[PDB]
């Protein structure tokens, strides 16, 4: 049920309003760094680990070993790119 | 358990020592023990080994590959049709491969990770092959487009290789999202994406009056895709582009291995499918502009990548005829012509990579040819009268299929237009024999004498285009095996 | 995990084991699956050793040749020797055996 | 035992989460009848809409 | 009518993606940017037709098309940046050297 | 429904309140620590001081500079503020205690997180100011940074349970919390969370002596306001988090009926007020990292040690067969 | 209505990035559809979806065009055109498109036509598969790892080639 | 050089020990009595050198 | 035709997509399985039924 | 001599070595202790 989700919704309309109130009482009275590039790309990586985690995580009890060993896999893969990416100095900010 | 992993022992293989050679490379790359070696020419003779082991897996589990086949069905089929692709795809790979010493050596190309990526695109491109359904499908196209992409720019600081880079990732980017587009109209329409539930649902209506305009539209974009991989007109002026500006090893590359993986997918996808003509047409279209466009574009060329760019294009027309036809010959023929187009390519391409240690550019750079290395000149004229269609070379026989299935399935404007475009291509190919042996220039070019790698492939290569007519048999077998097993 | 094992194409020679286990199919191995093995092995030592003379690292390009040539040439191995249990390679040794015990 | 100044605002900010806890318990509850259920689900709600008629309709 | 209305916004999400190319000739940026927009317009679409078709074959490859779609990004702007390295500006009269 | 906005209301004025009396006793706490006294004048010993403040602020001219961005200025704390209020939505208090109780609630804060970067990147580009933008760009590379490790640490909690209800996680500490068994877990989470709220030793906002301008620099009046107050909120928030996840939440001590006396929010209350000291007591014994070392730990020690114990907590309990 | 409105806010933000003159200010439109698509998912009652193109779409993929086109600083005149003179063109594709394909479900899937009549009381309940509810992320989840594990693991390998890239073509250690 | 020693370094680093020590002396003055002077109530000290208005 | 329901149980339309399957594999001529096919397209789309409710209330319109 | 190799890199990398024993026991529990208690339980 997504039933839960309409009182969130009210909640944001009136944080709006509160902020809206708080930031307007006053009203009365050329250089570019790879590094950031590199960290937004190892971000968006692990995000997307964090992200195939969340249903294997939940799913444990019915995948069983099967399940466990293909996610094993899968982080094998992305840590065998993490290591390629701490040898070749992604990971320092010297 | 494990028994069952028998269907993917080489991809396993070919995976975990891509993962071997990528560790290897990036340890002793970095290591000021040994002074920071280069490691492009040991990565790539490791990998050339992992290719022919993974060959060699292949080949010999023939049976082996279609084992548990219902416990895999829903990720991807081996066959017959399948176990022959992969093997043309890995000697393809080999040949590539092989041809990419002297570049490494003599360039100071000395980046091990083009090896890794040109590993890890053969891995999506044995995916592509035995793909089944339009996820896996989608999954290997794009791994092998994510990898085409980086090493299409690995000349990072060169303004071609950039600027081919930036082209190649923008265009295929567009294409890929038509054909995501395609696959989910497809499966809005049908509710199944396994190419079997799609062959059953399809079956026996194409076009009967009420016709789902939805299952029309996912056809006419994942089509859209396809013309886009194969260079076909109108959805082809990236690849002249991508292909003069990518390092020439990358260029080899590209001119061959992705024809064989997504032909193949197309052969699956359509021919194993059920549709109207509708799709023989579009690719009918296709190949009678490709062969126009490619034809007039080629005898506009100064250049000698632009050239076998456009020549390649004009080529890929006369092959997507066979498909238009819709008959058995027609996907043997399909296949032969394939074949011979990689053979030709290959040949054409060590040709050039020799010749880049000079850096050669234009094709007035080979005058006087003839001259300084006479059998190098005889073994170019002997590829360019091959691609020109001259009888008895090896290159006659997709012109002899050109006509013989138009005068057969019934076309003459298709026939008029061969004409036309082979007198066009046999002009444009004998004016490279015209420079190398007719011309008289001022100033001369000396080349440095080619390794011995692209030495022995081109003599191999050369022997098999004189003489591949008296002996075509196994070819002719294999294709059409080949073209039966798509069906029984 | 529902498994099967059955193939495709029917097996042409007698199905000694039809899903033989791991240990199974490696005491299964024949003089000419080590033979298979060792020369795999061996070659992708000398591709190792001889291709990395240049960079100036023979030994350790000898390692990761031969860790290659270690991981492949037991596939080879094991291939053949569960096809040949499985029926789907000429095993008429693995039939004296059967026969037999 | 000056330092029971610092323990005043800590007590504080303690009491303001212990009513942002209660006091939207206690609206629910009254407006309600019932204090909220943790985990209504599919079933829950079924037999909330079917109760709605079984009472009304008796 | 709820199926044909949010099919209607996964299209307009697509036809957006298209004009977006159409129209930013000289800005290569907001090309790639359509593209994206476009993956998300076929993302959708899975999802809805799963709903729609009571089958969990679309929400796997939703996800793995965000995958796919992570990728491209990264490599695209990837390629963004060496080009705008190589050259000091992302103008569209200085990647157009090869022609012809 | 008409009565959703009551408890809205009830859960943002107490949540204010307790922020204005947080800062209160951050100064009080730090204070008394070097031997002097804090805010002690504006009311009794100082309890009027959060109001003076908030009034002071409130009648400040707003500058609003004379930027190109004036909309993206000023909406920027508005983003980070409302972020910071509406993971709230779904923090229980005790056993029904609770606004909104989502299914998914594990993998919306994690959402939310994920969100809160945008407030300070655009402040940072919006103010045109370089040292204001490099200062954004670097505390926002360190946010998305222990993001991650934060993502990891949440798997392993969600491993334990096999449910994204904070309800549900709750509950599943009733035989033991899981700070016990994974203490080292809840110390990388509590550092994680320090350096993604921006706190000392990971403040480089407040790093000004050292030529580290912070992004908010250009904001004066309400709009440095609300990013105080965001920020001051976040805290609360991940104190709360680390009661939730490894205290037991709102649970007593010991399960018996002397503890199971006292209302479970007094529990939750305590629990997160230690959090909020430790907070406060960190701030006032180490010196900072530099954002290169910060940037070091944060990928080279706390990704690796959170993807290690994803694995071994997971392998343990399907070896087991003691998952949920 | 409620799907209108979306729809309307969907429409005027994706016309915001491909219209407006400043790109940051285009990437700051296209979190706004991302946020307006995953409301329009929360409709459809998927929540893991919804949340998963927050987490991704905005806080990653979004969070990497902000840095790279901020750090561009790319001034008006190198991106700037007058798109008046695109009005024929765009409208006469944007025709086509629009009335084969807003309306290619029509045929196959006929609109129910609201009658004036509680057409809610023909509603079937079955309680046999309310018992125990799965989540969406179970759903998922139960397919993702162990039946179609292939296709998990090419993904993997689709992005272990995106950190190769990404380190190949932009790295320049000091 | 020794497995003791180097577990002993391993520990202290992975532990954090040595900012137990510095959180723990941190907290000794809480609890202490405030030099702070109640200005203006009451004064600092001085002498009767003082060099103040003239 | 998967059979993997977005709610953990067996999807609506499967057992229609078999029946149409089980018909295929053994008929030499599709259009024996035309009745099974169409029912399976019904399941998917909905569209007779849809159709025959809008004659019903267009009738009822015509006759306000 | 690979044996004081392993104590340089315990005492240099204390972080890597900590999370490469926690997930190598994380990766050993299911590889052979749950087939060992798979076999025991058969039998
Ligand atoms: C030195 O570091 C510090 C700051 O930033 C640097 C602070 O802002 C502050 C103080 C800032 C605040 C207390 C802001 C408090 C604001 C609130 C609690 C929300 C509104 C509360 C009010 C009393 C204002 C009421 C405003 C209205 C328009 C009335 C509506 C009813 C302190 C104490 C501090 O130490």
Same mark, same amino acid.
């Given at each position: 049920?997504?039933?839960?989700?309409?009182?969130?919704?009210?909640?944001?309309?009136?944080?709006?309003?509160?902020?809206?109130?708080?930031?307007?009482?006053?009203?009365?009275?050329?250089?570019?760094?790879?590094?950031?590039?590199?960290?937004?790309?190892?971000?968006?990586?692990?995000?997307?680990?964090?992200?195939?985690?969340?249903?294997?995580?939940?799913?444990?009890?019915?995948?069983?070993?099967?399940?466990?060993?293909?996610?094993?896999?899968?982080?094998?893969?992305?840590?065998?790119?993490?290591?390629?990416?701490?040898?070749?100095?992604?990971?320092?900010?010297? | 358990?494990?028994?069952?992993?028998?269907?993917?022992?080489?991809?396993?293989?070919?995976?975990?020592?891509?993962?071997?050679?990528?560790?290897?490379?990036?340890?002793?790359?970095?290591?000021?023990?040994?002074?920071?070696?280069?490691?492009?020419?040991?990565?790539?003779?490791?990998?050339?080994?992992?290719?022919?082991?993974?060959?060699?897996?292949?080949?010999?589990?023939?049976?082996?590959?279609?084992?548990?086949?219902?416990?895999?069905?829903?990720?991807?089929?081996?066959?017959?049709?399948?176990? /022959?692709?992969?093997?043309?795809?890995?000697?393809?790979?080999?040949?590539?491969?092989?041809?990419?010493?002297?570049?490494?050596?003599?360039?100071?190309?000395?980046? /091990?990770?083009?090896?890794?990526?040109?590993?890890?695109?053969?891995?999506?491109?044995?995916?592509?092959?035995?793909?089944?359904?339009?996820?896996?499908?989608?999954?290997?196209?794009?791994?092998?487009?994510?990898?085409?992409?980086?090493?299409?720019?690995?000349?990072?600081?060169?303004?071609?290789?950039?600027?081919?880079?930036?082209?190649?990732?923008?265009?295929?980017?567009?294409?890929?999202?038509? &054909?995501?587009?395609?696959?989910?109209?497809?499966?809005?329409?049908?509710?199944?994406?396994?190419?079997?539930?799609?062959?059953?649902?399809?079956?026996?209506?194409?076009?009967?009056?009420?016709?789902?305009?939805?299952?029309?539209?996912?056809?006419? /974009?994942?089509?859209?895709?396809?013309?886009?991989?194969?260079?076909?007109?109108?959805?082809?002026?990236?690849?002249?582009?991508?292909?003069?500006?990518?390092?020439?090893?990358?260029?080899?590359?590209?001119?061959?291995?992705?024809?064989?993986?997504?032909?193949?997918?197309?052969? !699956?996808?359509?021919?194993?499918?059920?549709?109207?003509?509708?799709?023989?047409?579009?690719?009918?279209?296709?190949?009678?502009?490709?062969?126009?466009?490619?034809?007039?574009?080629?005898?506009?060329?100064?250049?000698?990548?632009?050239?076998?760019?456009?020549?390649?294009?004009?080529?890929?027309?006369?092959?997507?005829?066979?498909?238009?036809?819709?008959?058995?010959?027609?996907?043997?023929?399909? &296949?032969?012509?394939?074949?011979?187009?990689?053979?030709?390519?290959?040949?054409?391409?060590?040709?050039?990579?020799?010749?880049?240690?000079? !850096?050669?550019?234009?094709?007035?750079?080979?005058?006087?040819?003839?001259?300084?290395?006479?059998?190098?000149?005889?073994?170019?004229?002997?590829?360019?009268?091959?691609?020109?269609?001259?009888?008895?070379?090896?290159?006659?026989?997709?012109?002899?299929?050109?006509?013989?299935?138009?005068?057969?399935?019934?076309?003459?404007?298709?026939?008029?237009?061969?004409?036309?475009?082979?007198?066009?291509?046999?002009?444009?190919?004998? !004016?490279?024999?015209?420079?190398?042996?007719?011309?008289?220039?001022?100033?001369?070019?000396?080349?440095?004498?080619?390794?011995?790698?692209?030495?022995?492939?081109?003599?191999?290569?050369?022997?098999?285009?004189?003489?591949?007519?008296?002996?075509?048999?196994?070819?002719?077998?294999?294709?059409?095996?080949?073209?039966?097993?798509?069906?029984? | 995990?529902?498994?099967?094992?059955?193939?495709?194409?029917?097996?042409?020679?007698?199905?000694?084991?039809?899903?033989?286990?791991?240990?199974?199919?490696?005491?299964?191995?024949?003089?000419?699956?080590?033979?298979?093995?060792?020369?795999?092995?061996?070659?992708?030592?000398?591709?190792?050793?001889?291709?990395?003379?240049?960079?100036?690292?023979?030994?350790?390009?000898?390692?990761?040749?031969?860790?290659?040539?270690?991981?492949?040439?037991?596939?080879?191995?094991?291939?053949?020797?569960?096809?040949?249990?499985?029926?789907?390679?000429?095993?008429?040794?693995?039939?004296?055996?059967?026969?037999?015990? | 035992?000056?330092?029971?100044?610092?323990?005043?605002?800590?007590?504080?900010?303690?009491?303001?989460?212990?009513?942002?806890?209660?006091?939207?318990?206690?609206?629910?509850?009254?407006?309600?009848?019932?204090?909220?259920?943790?985990?209504?689900?599919?079933?829950?709600?079924?037999?909330?809409?079917?109760?709605?008629?079984?009472?009304?309709?008796? | 009518?709820?199926?044909?209305?949010?099919?209607?916004? *996964?299209?307009?999400?697509?036809?957006?993606?298209?004009?977006?190319?159409?129209?930013?000739?000289?800005?290569?940026?907001?090309?790639?940017? *359509?593209?994206?927009?476009?993956?998300?317009?076929?993302?959708?679409?899975?999802?809805?037709? *799963?709903?729609?078709?009571?089958?969990?074959?679309?929400?796997?490859?939703?996800?793995?098309?965000?995958?796919?779609?992570?990728?491209? *990004?990264?490599?695209?702007?990837?390629?963004?940046?060496?080009?705008?390295?190589?050259?000091?500006?992302?103008?569209?009269?200085?990647?157009?050297?090869?022609?012809? | 429904?008409?009565?959703?906005?009551?408890?809205?209301?009830?859960?943002?004025?107490?949540?204010?309140?307790?922020?204005?009396?947080?800062?209160?006793?951050?100064?009080?706490?730090?204070?008394?620590?070097?031997?002097?006294?804090?805010?002690?004048?504006?009311?009794?010993?100082?309890?009027?001081?959060?109001?003076?403040?908030?009034?002071?602020?409130?009648?400040?001219?707003?500058?609003?500079?004379?930027?190109?961005?004036?909309?993206?200025?000023?909406?920027?704390?508005?983003?980070?503020?409302?972020?910071?209020?509406?993971?709230?939505?779904?923090?229980?208090?005790?056993?029904?205690?609770?606004?909104?109780?989502?299914?998914?609630?594990?993998?919306?804060?994690?959402?939310?997180?994920?969100?809160?970067?945008?407030?300070?990147?655009?402040?940072?580009?919006?103010?045109?100011?370089?040292?204001?933008?490099?200062?954004?760009?670097?505390?926002?590379?360190?946010?998305?940074?222990?993001?991650?490790?934060?993502?990891?640490?949440?798997?392993?909690?969600?491993?334990?349970?096999?449910?994204?209800?904070?309800?549900?996680?709750?509950?599943?500490?009733?035989?033991?919390?899981?700070?016990?068994?994974?203490?080292?877990?809840?110390?990388?989470?509590?550092?994680?969370?320090?350096?993604?709220?921006?706190?000392?030793?990971?403040?480089?906002?407040?790093?000004?002596?050292?030529?580290?301008?912070?992004?908010?620099?250009?904001?004066?009046?309400?709009?440095?306001?609300?990013?105080?107050?965001?920020?001051?909120?976040?805290?609360?928030?991940?104190?709360?988090?680390?009661?939730?996840?490894?205290?037991?939440?709102?649970?007593?001590?010991?399960?018996?009926?002397?503890?199971?006396?006292?209302?479970?929010?007094?529990?939750?209350?305590?629990?997160?007020?230690?959090?909020?000291?430790?907070?406060?007591?960190?701030?006032?014994?180490?010196?900072?990292?530099?954002?290169?070392?910060?940037?070091?730990?944060?990928?080279?020690?706390?990704?690796?040690?959170?993807?290690?114990?994803?694995?071994?907590?997971?392998?343990?309990?399907?070896?087991?067969?003691?998952?949920? | 209505?409620?799907?209108?409105?979306?729809?309307?806010? #969907?429409?005027?933000?994706?016309?915001?990035?491909?219209?407006?003159?400043?790109?940051?200010?285009?990437?700051?439109?296209?979190?706004?559809?991302?946020?307006?698509?995953?409301?329009?998912?929360?409709?459809?009652?998927?929540?893991?979806?919804?949340?998963?193109?927050?987490?991704?779409?905005?806080?990653?993929?979004?969070?990497?065009?902000?840095?790279?086109?901020?750090?561009?600083?790319?001034?008006?005149?190198?991106?700037?055109?007058?798109?008046?003179?695109?009005?024929?063109?765009?409208?006469?594709?944007?025709?086509?498109?629009?009335?084969?394909?807003?309306?290619?479900?029509?045929?196959?899937?006929?609109?129910?036509?609201?009658?004036?009549?509680?057409?809610?009381?023909?509603?079937?309940?079955?309680? #046999?598969?309310?018992?125990?509810?799965?989540?969406?992320?179970?759903?998922?989840?139960?397919?993702?790892?162990?039946?179609?594990?292939?296709?998990?693991?090419?993904?993997?390998?689709?992005?272990?080639?995106?950190?190769?890239?990404?380190?190949?073509?932009?790295?320049?250690?000091? | 050089?020794?497995?003791?020693?180097?577990?002993?370094?391993?520990?202290?680093?992975?532990?954090?020990?040595?900012?137990?020590?510095?959180?723990?002396?941190?907290?000794?003055?809480?609890?202490?009595?405030?030099?702070?002077?109640?200005?203006?109530?009451?004064?600092?000290?001085?002498?009767?050198?003082?060099?103040?208005?003239? | 035709?998967?059979?993997?329901?977005?709610?953990?149980?067996?999807?609506? %339309?499967?057992?229609?997509?078999?029946?149409?399957?089980?018909?295929?594999?053994?008929?030499?001529?599709?259009?024996? %399985?035309?009745?099974?096919?169409?029912?399976?397209?019904?399941?998917?789309?909905?569209?007779?039924?849809?159709?025959?409710?809008?004659?019903?209330?267009?009738?009822?319109?015509?006759?306000? | 001599?690979?044996?004081?190799?392993?104590?340089?890199?315990?005492?240099?990398?204390?972080?890597?070595?900590?999370?490469?024993?926690?997930?190598?026991?994380?990766?050993?529990?299911?590889?052979?202790?749950?087939?060992?208690?798979?076999?025991?339980?058969?039998?």
């Amino acid at each position: 049920m997504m039933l839960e989700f309409a009182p969130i919704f009210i909640y944001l309309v009136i944080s709006l309003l509160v902020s809206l109130i708080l930031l307007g009482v006053p009203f009365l009275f050329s250089r570019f760094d790879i590094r950031f590039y590199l960290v937004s790309i190892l971000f968006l990586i692990f995000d997307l680990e964090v992200t195939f985690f969340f249903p294997w995580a939940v799913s444990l009890n019915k995948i069983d070993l099967f399940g466990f060993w293909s996610m094993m896999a899968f982080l094998f893969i992305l840590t065998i790119g993490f290591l390629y990416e701490w040898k070749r100095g992604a990971l320092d900010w010297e | 358990m494990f028994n069952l992993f028998l269907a993917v022992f080489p991809e396993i293989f070919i995976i975990n020592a891509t993962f071997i050679l990528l560790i290897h490379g990036v340890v002793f790359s970095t290591s000021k023990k040994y002074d920071y070696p280069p490691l492009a020419s040991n990565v790539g003779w490791l990998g050339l080994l992992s290719v022919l082991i993974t060959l060699l897996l292949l080949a010999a589990g023939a049976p082996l590959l279609t084992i548990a086949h219902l416990f895999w069905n829903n990720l991807f089929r081996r066959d017959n049709f399948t176990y /022959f692709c992969q093997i043309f795809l890995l000697l393809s790979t080999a040949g590539t491969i092989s041809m990419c010493f002297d570049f490494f050596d003599q360039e100071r190309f000395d980046a /091990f990770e083009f090896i890794v990526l040109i590993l890890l695109s053969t891995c999506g491109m044995l995916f592509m092959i035995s793909a089944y359904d339009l996820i896996a499908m989608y999954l290997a196209i794009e791994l092998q487009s994510l990898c085409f992409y980086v090493i299409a720019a690995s000349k990072r600081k060169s303004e071609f290789s950039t600027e081919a880079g930036l082209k190649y990732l923008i265009l295929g980017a567009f294409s890929s999202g038509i &054909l995501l587009f395609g696959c989910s109209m497809i499966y809005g329409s049908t509710g199944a994406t396994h190419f079997d539930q799609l062959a059953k649902i399809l079956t026996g209506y194409e076009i009967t009056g009420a016709r789902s305009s939805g299952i029309f539209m996912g056809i006419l /974009f994942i089509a859209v895709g396809f013309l886009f991989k194969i260079t076909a007109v109108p959805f082809h002026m990236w690849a002249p582009d991508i292909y003069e500006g990518s390092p020439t090893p990358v260029t080899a590359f590209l001119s061959i291995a992705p024809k064989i993986s997504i032909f193949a997918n197309i052969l !699956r996808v359509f021919i194993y499918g059920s549709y109207g003509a509708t799709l023989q047409q579009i690719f009918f279209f296709c190949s009678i502009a490709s062969m126009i466009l490619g034809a007039l574009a080629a005898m506009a060329q100064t250049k000698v990548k632009r050239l076998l760019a456009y020549s390649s294009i004009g080529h890929v027309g006369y092959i997507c005829i066979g498909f238009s036809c819709g008959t058995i010959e027609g996907i043997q023929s399909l &296949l032969i012509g394939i074949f011979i187009y990689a053979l030709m390519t290959m040949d054409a391409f060590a040709i050039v990579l020799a010749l880049r240690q000079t !850096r050669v550019k234009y094709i007035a750079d080979l005058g006087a040819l003839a001259k300084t290395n006479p059998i190098l000149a005889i073994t170019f004229s002997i590829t360019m009268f091959s691609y020109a269609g001259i009888p008895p070379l090896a290159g006659f026989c997709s012109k002899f299929y050109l006509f013989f299935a138009a005068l057969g399935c019934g076309a003459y404007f298709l026939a008029l237009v061969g004409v036309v475009t082979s007198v066009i291509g046999c002009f444009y190919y004998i !004016r490279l024999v015209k420079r190398m042996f007719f011309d008289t220039p001022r100033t001369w070019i000396l080349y440095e004498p080619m390794d011995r790698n692209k030495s022995l492939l081109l003599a191999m290569t050369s022997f098999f285009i004189t003489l591949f007519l008296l002996y075509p048999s196994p070819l002719f077998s294999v294709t059409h095996q080949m073209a039966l097993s798509l069906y029984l | 995990m529902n498994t099967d094992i059955t193939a495709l194409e029917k097996a042409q020679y007698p199905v000694v084991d039809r899903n033989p286990a791991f240990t199974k199919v490696v005491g299964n191995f024949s003089t000419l699956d080590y033979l298979r093995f060792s020369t795999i092995t061996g070659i992708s030592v000398t591709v190792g050793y001889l291709s990395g003379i240049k960079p100036g690292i023979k030994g350790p390009s000898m390692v990761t040749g031969g860790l290659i040539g270690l991981m492949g040439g037991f596939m080879y191995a094991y291939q053949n020797s569960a096809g040949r249990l499985m029926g789907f390679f000429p095993n008429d040794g693995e039939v004296a055996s059967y026969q037999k015990r | 035992l000056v330092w029971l100044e610092a323990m005043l605002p800590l007590g504080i900010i303690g009491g303001m989460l212990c009513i942002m806890g209660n006091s939207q318990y206690y609206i629910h509850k009254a407006y309600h009848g019932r204090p909220k259920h943790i985990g209504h689900d599919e079933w829950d709600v079924a037999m909330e809409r079917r109760d709605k008629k079984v009472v009304e309709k008796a | 009518m709820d199926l044909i209305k949010y099919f209607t916004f *996964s299209m307009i999400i697509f036809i957006l993606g298209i004009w977006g190319i159409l129209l930013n000739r000289r800005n290569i940026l907001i090309m790639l940017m *359509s593209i994206e927009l476009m993956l998300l317009a076929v993302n959708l679409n899975f999802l809805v037709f *799963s709903v729609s078709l009571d089958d969990m074959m679309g929400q796997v490859f939703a996800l793995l098309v965000l995958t796919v779609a992570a990728a491209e *990004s990264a490599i695209g702007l990837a390629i963004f940046v060496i080009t705008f390295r190589v050259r000091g500006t992302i103008a569209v009269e200085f990647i157009n050297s090869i022609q012809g | 429904y008409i009565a959703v906005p009551a408890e809205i209301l009830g859960i943002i004025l107490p949540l204010l309140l307790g922020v204005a009396f947080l800062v209160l006793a951050e100064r009080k706490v730090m204070a008394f620590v070097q031997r002097r006294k804090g805010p002690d004048v504006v009311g009794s010993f100082g309890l009027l001081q959060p109001l003076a403040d908030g009034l002071k602020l409130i009648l400040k001219e707003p500058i609003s500079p004379s930027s190109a961005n004036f909309f993206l200025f000023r909406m920027a704390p508005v983003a980070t503020f409302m972020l910071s209020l509406v993971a709230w939505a779904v923090v229980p208090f005790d056993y029904g205690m609770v606004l909104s109780d989502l299914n998914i609630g594990l993998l919306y804060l994690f959402a939310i997180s994920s969100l809160g970067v945008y407030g300070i990147i655009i402040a940072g580009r919006s103010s045109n100011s370089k040292y204001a933008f490099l200062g954004a760009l670097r505390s926002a590379a360190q946010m998305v940074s222990y993001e991650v490790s934060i993502g990891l640490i949440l798997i392993t909690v969600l491993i334990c349970v096999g449910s994204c209800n904070l309800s549900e996680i709750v509950m599943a500490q009733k035989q033991i919390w899981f700070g016990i068994p994974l203490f080292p877990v809840l110390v990388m989470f509590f550092i994680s969370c320090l350096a993604e709220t921006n706190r000392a030793p990971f403040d480089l906002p407040e790093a000004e002596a050292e030529l580290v301008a912070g992004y908010n620099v250009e904001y004066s009046s309400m709009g440095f306001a609300l990013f105080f107050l965001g920020e001051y909120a976040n805290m609360i928030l991940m104190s709360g988090l680390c009661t939730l996840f490894f205290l037991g939440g709102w649970l007593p001590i010991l399960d018996l009926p002397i503890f199971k006396k006292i209302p479970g929010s007094i529990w939750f209350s305590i629990k997160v007020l230690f959090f909020l000291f430790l907070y406060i007591w960190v701030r006032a014994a180490f010196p900072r990292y530099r954002y290169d070392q910060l940037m070091g730990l944060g990928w080279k020690v706390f990704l690796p040690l959170s993807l290690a114990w994803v694995v071994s907590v997971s392998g343990l309990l399907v070896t087991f067969q003691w998952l949920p | 209505m409620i799907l209108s409105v979306l729809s309307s806010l #969907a429409l005027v933000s994706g016309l915001m990035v491909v219209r407006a003159k400043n790109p940051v200010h285009s990437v700051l439109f296209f979190i706004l559809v991302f946020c307006d698509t995953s409301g329009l998912l929360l409709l459809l009652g998927l929540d893991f979806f919804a949340m998963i193109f927050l987490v991704v779409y905005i806080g990653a993929i979004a969070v990497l065009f902000l840095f790279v086109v901020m750090m561009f600083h790319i001034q008006i005149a190198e991106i700037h055109e007058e798109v008046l003179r695109y009005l024929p063109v765009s409208g006469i594709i944007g025709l086509i498109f629009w009335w084969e394909m807003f309306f290619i479900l029509d045929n196959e899937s006929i609109p129910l036509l609201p009658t004036q009549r509680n057409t809610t009381s023909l509603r079937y309940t079955v309680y #046999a598969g309310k018992v125990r509810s799965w989540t969406n992320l179970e759903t998922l989840g139960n397919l993702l790892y162990t039946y179609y594990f292939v296709w998990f693991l090419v993904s993997s390998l689709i992005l272990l080639v995106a950190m190769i890239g990404a380190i190949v073509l932009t790295m320049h250690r000091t | 050089k020794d497995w003791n020693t180097v577990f002993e370094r391993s520990i202290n680093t992975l532990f954090l020990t040595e900012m137990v020590r510095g959180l723990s002396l941190t907290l000794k003055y809480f609890f202490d009595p405030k030099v702070t002077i109640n200005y203006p109530f009451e004064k600092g000290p001085l002498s009767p050198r003082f060099r103040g208005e003239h | 035709a998967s059979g993997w329901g977005i709610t953990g149980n067996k999807g609506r %339309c499967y057992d229609f997509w078999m029946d149409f399957s089980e018909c295929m594999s053994h008929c030499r001529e599709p259009k024996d %399985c035309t009745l099974l096919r169409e029912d399976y397209l019904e399941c998917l789309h909905h569209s007779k039924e849809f159709q025959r409710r809008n004659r019903i209330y267009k009738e009822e319109q015509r006759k306000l | 001599p690979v044996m004081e190799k392993l104590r340089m890199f315990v005492a240099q990398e204390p972080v890597v070595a900590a999370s490469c024993l926690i997930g190598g026991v994380g990766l050993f529990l299911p590889a052979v202790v749950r087939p060992i208690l798979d076999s025991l339980e058969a039998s």
